[PDB]
Design a protein around this nucleic acid. Structure first.
Lengths: 99, 126, 82, 103, 100, 155, 116
RNA sequence: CUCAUGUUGCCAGCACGUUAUGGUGGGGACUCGUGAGAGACUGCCGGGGUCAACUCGGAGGAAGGUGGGGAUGACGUCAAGUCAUCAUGCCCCUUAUGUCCAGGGCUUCACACAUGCUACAAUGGCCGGUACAAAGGGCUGCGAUGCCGUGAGGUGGAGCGAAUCCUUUCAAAGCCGGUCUCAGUUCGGAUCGGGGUCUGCAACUCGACCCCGUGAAGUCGGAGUCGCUAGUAAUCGCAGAUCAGCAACGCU
């Protein structure tokens, strides 16, 4: 058949799962074939830092910017559904690669 | 089908335990092809040693993760758990030597200000 | 070491000045500010001087001074001892 | 080990006419005279350079090696002499303590 | 650091953005093959005619807020001090204190 | 250990024979975590013993252990201007530990071009009653005979 | 046996035996052995005058030796010290010359660790 | 540990490529990557115990007696440190202690102190043959295969904002065969003389790297001291923030 693949990127797991359910819903609204957010890995961009100025290199701290990622493969891309899913609304925290 | 798992410090092995002979096959090879380490062989054998059923139950493995000794402990673990699926009645005599537990002892986080896990820099007083 | 595919580092100032000089055919003491310029055998005629952080040093040229930098012939640090 | 007394002279920023060295080397041999277990002596000249000093203009820390414990003596004064002699006395206090605690 | 020094690094970025766009690139392109006119190019001696500031080695990743020319993290693009302070105020996405 | 001891470890057995004195020995010669290397060194030395005296090497090893295994040893305590040594009975665990430690570390400073020879022939020596291990054991017993006088502290 | 200027040992595999000459190391030794075609599992006691002679001809044709090498280095150093290069001045001092540490270490050139 | 979750990764049950191979359909079964919840609560046993806590040996368990390690600094001192990350009260420069410029330095050394590693060898030096980890980095960049170079290196670019692709289908100890046969030594690598590579406009003070020759001190360490109670110590190597390239053997 045919596919259209979405790769969702975020930092909030609650919200990436929220928009996952929302997008799966809006894909289901057309009776169009829907699969689900497969549990695929997440990057972890990590950065160690020192706390204080001018000395005390032994005291440090860590920080960890994760990257929540979800693949959603939509089968049966009826072009009505395609141009509908082109026009979902979301808040700011999530970004999406439509390919 | 019969399938159980073994994991020791990032050393995973799956197992097929069949009622045949003790034929060992480990990723296109055998226990005498890999593992030139006799203490490791003892580990690998200790469950069948325990039940006195050495050469009563074929085993087929797929090794991945960890190094030889981690893989070894995971192997003997999975073989014993498969023997428990064969029959649990022998289990409370295997806890008598405890050849059944997962090793809850993994490598440690490396800390800051220091050289590794617990080796501190030389507290120099000059 | 200067790579060979790149060739030498002969810098424009003294390269063009010494073009002008050998086309005058005349030779005199000539100052320059570049330690980082590499040496050609075409310098065995002229006398070059360089600055070293305090003042200038002149130096006369020889056959086997080729392939080198002029800073190699300027004393940059003075250590007479304790 | 008598010229083996590892003098360490130090000053972060103070005008140092050459007699501080005389005073200090001699005031260190002073206590070399009666303790033979000594390797290093660190000697420091420091100064707060604050307007309206709180009667602490010059400051001195001295620290000395020994076979096991070390010796530690701090003093503070308005100039070189009161501080050096005070630190010398405090060294002697630590050292008398340690040599009474030897036998 | 200083206003003047941040201004000068900003000037140098403008120079580089101008001239390493294509001017300080074509000589590299032609002078990397061994078919080059190096034997009579004077393109090396011509790259000596361009300003030294044409080269990017003179740049430095200074912070945008302070200009600390050290301790700089390209991902945040900041001095480590300001990095600490932002993540302390909770002003960067999904950033937190972790363990393992 | 201001609160109490921890249990001593669940030691392994020898894979081949069934005497954990062997693994005690290999763990005490183990050097930079090269256990299988020390182990093949062990097996080679033991096979030398077997082919050089026609016996099972573990028995002659027990023989040498019986030779050098002390019962009485020293324990020091600084008291009253002249730090005293004191005789102490020594339980089996520390006895065996110390005997094997002597045996290994005095096999080390021998002159056979190779550890397989130094070790094995030192074992032969301590077995049949000649080695530097036995020498140091006698030295220790003589020291206990010396400082018999100070047992009465009972420590 | 005897050669261009060094007394060969006896129980040294040839690749190691030739290494005792100044202009010969392990790589050049084995390169020469490969060029000759002799088994490098041999001893010097069992070597032939024929092979030694042709080896000798070969190396004196295609490889400078002890004396010419010492001569070469002497020439290099008197040259770069008479033109007054920085290498030359550091060699006058006896200090490490290749742009190295100089303050604390480099006792190999500063002599013994003589206390002051 | 129960259920789901099926690719960019598994791949037992099946059919098809066969030189490199999960490589392709096909099963989400075991793995599994990501999330939710039960599991340790002296939970129950019986003897001790102001009968209270507090314990002593048990079953069951994957873990059992604050599972382990993490994060987390009570009020304050040391007038602790940073007016040079930053902020700033007061004093001063202003024709200059500001400021724009190229050169030089912060790497000077008859020495001292401190941190570490590389060694003083046969558990070791050398060639060759065989298998596996975790783990992350990437676009005006990571760079594959082919071939040429001794080898660093190279036109070139497949594929790649990346569970795929560069990341050999990812390694070193280790194993198998043989030599070296205990000695300033096939140990050790300084140090220098030359032959050279890459980046940078520029390798002299002053960069890393391969190759040739070079072959020094060092034959287990003094009075005392330092770190370590389990997946710890000791050892092998990997990866990387910063960074064009580097002293990074540091740091994580």
């Amino acid at each position: 058949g045919q596919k259209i693949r979405i790769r969702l990127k975020a930092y909030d797991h609650e919200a990436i799962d929220a928009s996952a359910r929302k997008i799966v819903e809006t894909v289901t609204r057309t009776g169009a074939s829907v699969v689900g957010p497969v549990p695929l890995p997440t990057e972890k961009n990590v950065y160690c830092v020192i706390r204080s100025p001018h000395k005390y290199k032994d005291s440090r701290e860590h920080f960890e910017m994760r990257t929540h990622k979800r693949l959603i493969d939509i089968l049966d891309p009826t072009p009505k559904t395609v141009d509908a899913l082109m026009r979902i609304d979301l808040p700011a925290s999530v970004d999406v690669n439509i390919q | 089908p019969i399938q159980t798992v073994g994991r020791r410090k990032e050393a995973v092995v799956r197992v097929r335990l069949v009622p045949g002979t003790g034929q060992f096959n480990l990723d296109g090879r055998t226990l005498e092809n890999y593992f030139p380490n006799k203490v490791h062989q003892q580990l690998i054998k200790a469950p069948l040693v325990t039940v006195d059923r050495v050469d009563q139950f074929d085993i087929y493995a797929h090794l991945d993760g960890g190094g030889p000794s981690g893989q070894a402990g995971a192997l003997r673990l999975a073989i014993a758990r498969a023997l428990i699926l064969v029959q649990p009645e022998d289990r409370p005599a295997l806890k008598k030597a405890g050849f059944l537990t997962r090793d809850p002892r993994a490598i440690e986080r490396k800390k800051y200000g220091l050289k590794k896990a617990r080796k501190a820099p030389q507290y120099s007083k000059r | 070491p200067r790579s060979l595919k790149k060739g030498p580092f002969v810098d424009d100032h003294l390269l063009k000045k010494v073009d002008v000089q050998n086309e005058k055919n005349t030779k005199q003491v000539i100052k320059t500010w570049s330690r980082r310029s590499t040496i050609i055998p075409d310098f065995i005629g002229h006398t070059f001087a360089v600055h070293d952080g305090r003042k200038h040093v002149p130096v006369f040229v020889t056959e086997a001074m080729v392939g080198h930098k002029l800073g190699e012939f300027a004393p940059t640090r003075t250590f007479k001892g304790h | 080990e008598r010229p083996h007394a590892e003098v360490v002279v130090k000053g972060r920023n103070v005008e140092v006419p050459d007699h501080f060295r005389t005073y200090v080397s001699e005031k260190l041999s002073r206590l070399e005279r009666f303790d033979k277990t000594i390797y290093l002596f660190d000697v420091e000249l420091d100064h707060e350079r604050n307007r309206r000093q709180r009667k602490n203009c010059q400051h001195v820390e001295i620290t000395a090696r020994g076979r096991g414990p070390v010796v530690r003596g701090e003093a503070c004064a308005d100039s070189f002499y009161t501080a050096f002699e005070s630190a010398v006395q405090k060294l002697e206090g630590r050292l008398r303590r340690a040599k009474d605690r030897r036998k | 650091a200083k206003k003047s020094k941040i201004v000068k690094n900003e000037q140098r970025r403008e120079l580089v953005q101008r001239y390493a766009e294509r001017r300080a690139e074509l000589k590299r392109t032609i002078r990397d093959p061994a078919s080059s006119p190096e034997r009579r190019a004077a393109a090396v001696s011509a790259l000596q005619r361009l300003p030294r500031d044409s080269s990017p080695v003179r740049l430095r990743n200074r912070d945008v807020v302070d200009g600390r020319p050290r301790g700089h993290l390209r991902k945040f693009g900041l001095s480590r001090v300001r990095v600490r302070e932002m993540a302390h105020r909770g002003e960067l996405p999904g950033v937190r204190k972790a363990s393992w | 250990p201001r609160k109490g001891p921890a249990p001593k470890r669940p030691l392994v057995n020898d894979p081949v024979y069934g005497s954990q004195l062997v693994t005690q020995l290999v763990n005490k010669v183990l050097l930079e975590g090269k256990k299988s290397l020390a182990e093949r060194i062990v097996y080679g030395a033991l096979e030398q013993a077997r082919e050089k005296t026609g016996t099972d090497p573990v028995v002659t090893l027990k023989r040498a252990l019986d030779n050098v295994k002390p019962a009485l040893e020293v324990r020091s305590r600084r008291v009253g201007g002249a730090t005293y040594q004191v005789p102490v009975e020594v339980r089996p665990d520390r006895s065996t530990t110390l005997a094997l430690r002597w045996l290994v570390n005095f096999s080390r400073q021998r002159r056979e071009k190779t550890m397989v020879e130094r070790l094995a022939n030192e074992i032969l020596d301590a077995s049949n009653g000649l080695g530097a291990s036995v020498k140091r054991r006698e030295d220790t017993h003589k020291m206990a005979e010396a400082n018999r006088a100070f047992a009465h502290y009972r420590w | 046996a005897r050669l261009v200027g060094v007394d060969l040992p006896r129980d040294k595999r040839m690749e190691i035996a030739l290494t005792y000459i100044y202009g010969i190391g392990r790589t050049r030794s084995n390169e020469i052995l490969a060029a000759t075609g002799i088994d490098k599992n041999m001893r010097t006691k069992d070597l032939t005058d024929d092979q030694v002679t042709v080896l000798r001809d070969y190396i004196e044709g295609n490889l400078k030796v002890e004396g010419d090498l010492r001569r070469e280095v002497q020439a290099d150093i008197r040259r770069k010290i008479e033109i007054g290069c920085y290498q030359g001045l550091r060699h006058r001092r006896g200090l490490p010359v290749r742009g190295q540490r100089t303050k604390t270490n480099a006792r190999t050139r500063k002599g013994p660790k003589r206390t002051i």
